[PDB]
Amino acid sequence: PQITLWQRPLVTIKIGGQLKEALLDTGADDTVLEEMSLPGRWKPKMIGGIGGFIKVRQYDQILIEICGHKAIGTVLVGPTPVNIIGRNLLTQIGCTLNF
Amino acid sequence: PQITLWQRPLVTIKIGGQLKEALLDTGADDTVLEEMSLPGRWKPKMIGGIGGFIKVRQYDQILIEICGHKAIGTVLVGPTPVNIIGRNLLTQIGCTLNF
Ligand SMILES: CNC(=O)[C@@H](NC(=O)[C@H](OCc1ccccc1)[C@H](O)[C@@H](O)[C@@H](OCc1ccccc1)C(=O)N[C@H]1c2ccccc2C[C@H]1O)C(C)C
């Protein structure tokens, strides 16, 4: 589809049997979701954005469904105010910026 | 043009007669640039990102050229980690997300 930016580009994602709302964020290198439970081992990581850094838990090889498109990648879980789909997953669904 | 996301979507912008690099960020409601001098009076504003909030200076009706496209709008100046072109200006140059 083609998404205009008059409003925030929010989409429904399916992860770990859960349906959630997330922002398609071209300004984010990684994908970060609000606190939740995911299977497997995880490692600590610090990510920085506007305002400073936050501590998150890194999970690798996580399957996420974005608008029907299956994508595999690293997902960070932590105290983010909004769920963010970053570039590591946007590339997998063939998402591009056009003007 | 069409921009893929395997790398950060950085473009050259021209403002105040000078060239700078900025990130096309669909996850940003507004445009925020690193500390610099702009004309006119400014108003206060607080913007919240991944790690908290920061105080910025808001300047209105500022001319800014993004990849050759001229835009005139609101620009925030403050302690941002990188120059960010947000939705307020992305819509002016007709930028959309596609997949
Ligand atoms: C390397 N670090 C990154 O890539 C990081 N990347 C980032 O933090 C990006 O910033 C550039 C950035 C790039 C590299 C390094 C540092 C910063 C995001 O796209 C950021 O822009 C956006 O985050 C999502 C969000 C949306 C809505 C509410 C709260 C958070 C955000 O904070 N938006 C707010 C904003 C920004 C500017 C002006 C106004 C407003 C209001 C909000 O929309 C993370 C995600 C991994």
Give me the CATH topology for the region B1-99: Cathepsin D, subunit A; domain 1 (2.40.70)
- Nearest-CA residue for atom 26 of ligand 1: B27
Looking up tokens 């100046």 gives B77
First to last CA, chain A: 15
Q: How many angstroms separate the CA atoms of B99 and B91, rounded? A: 18
Nearest to A99 among B1, B4, B99 (CB): B1
Looking up tokens 């998404």 gives A3
Q: How many angstroms separate the CA atoms of B98 and A59, rounded? A: 27
Q: How many angstroms separate the CA atoms of B13 and B3, rounded? A: 16
Structure tokens at A30: 């990684």
Residues 6+ apart with CB under 8 A from B26: A5, A9, A23, A24, A25, A26, A27, A97, B87, B90, B97
Paired sense of beta strands A43-49 and A32-33, if any: unpaired
What per-residue string of b and e applies to B48-87 under the rule 16 or more CB within 10 Å gives b?
ebbbeebebbbbeebebebbeeebebbbbbbebbbbbbbb
CA dist B46 to B9, B34, B43, B60, B79, Å? 25, 15, 10, 15, 11
Q: How many angstroms separate the CA atoms of A5 and B44, rounded? A: 25
Q: How many angstroms separate the CA atoms of B29 and B89, rounded? A: 9
CA-based nearest residue in chain A for residue B23: A27
Q: Which residues of A touch B84 (CB under 8 A)?
A: 27, 50
Of residues A15, A21, A30, the one with CA closest to residue A65:
A15
CA-based nearest residue in chain A for residue B89: A5
Cα B73 to ligand 1 centre (Å): 20
Looking up tokens 């008059």 gives A6
Q: How many angstroms separate the CA atoms of A56 and B48, rounded? A: 18
User: Quick check: helix, strand or coil at residue B36?
Assistant: coil
Q: How many angstroms separate the CA atoms of A69 and B60, rounded? A: 40
Q: Which amino acid is at A20?
A: K
Element (H, E) at B47: strand B43-49
Beta bridge pairs of residue B17 = none
Determination technique used: X-ray
Interface test with A, best of B50, B65, B84, B91 (most A CBs within 10 A): B50
Task: For chain A, give the DSSP string.
Answer: -EE-SSS--EEEEEETTEEEEEEE-TT-SS-EE-S---SS--EEEEEEETTEEEEEEEEEEEEEEETTEEEEEEEEESS-SS-EE-HHHHGGGT-EEE-
Q: Which residues of B touch A8 (CB under 8 A)?
A: 27, 29, 87
Tell me if A48 and B53 make a contact (CB, 8 A cut-off).
Answer: no
CB B26 within 8 A of CB A24: yes
CA-based nearest residue in chain A for residue B2: A98
Beta bridge pairs of residue B6 = none
First to last CA, chain B: 15
Q: How many angstroms separate the CA atoms of A62 and B51, rounded? A: 24
CB pairs under 8 A between A and B: 134
Of residues A7, A20, A47, A44, the one with CA closest to residue B52:
A47
Q: For this experimental structure, what is the resolution in angstroms?
A: 2.0
